[PDB]
């Protein structure tokens, strides 16, 4: 019933480098 989190672990990692890091460009520049 419960969906595996194996692919979710790496999923959040990608969003951390692609999305989160995207905001650091404007943040650090601020």
């Amino acid at each position: 019933k419960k969906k595996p989190l194996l692919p979710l672990l790496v999923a959040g990692a990608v969003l951390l480098l692609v999305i989160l890091v995207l905001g650091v460009m404007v943040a650090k520049k601020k």
Side-chain angles (χ1 to χ4, degrees):
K1 301 180 67 60
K2 297 294 180 61
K3 186 72 71 61
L5 288 72
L6 299 177
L8 282 68
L9 297 176
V10 300
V14 180
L15 305 174
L16 194 155
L17 280 299
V18 72
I19 295 172
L20 196 64
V21 181
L22 205 163
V24 322
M25 298 301 299
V26 58
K28 299 181 181 300
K29 182 179 292 181
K30 186 187 183 66

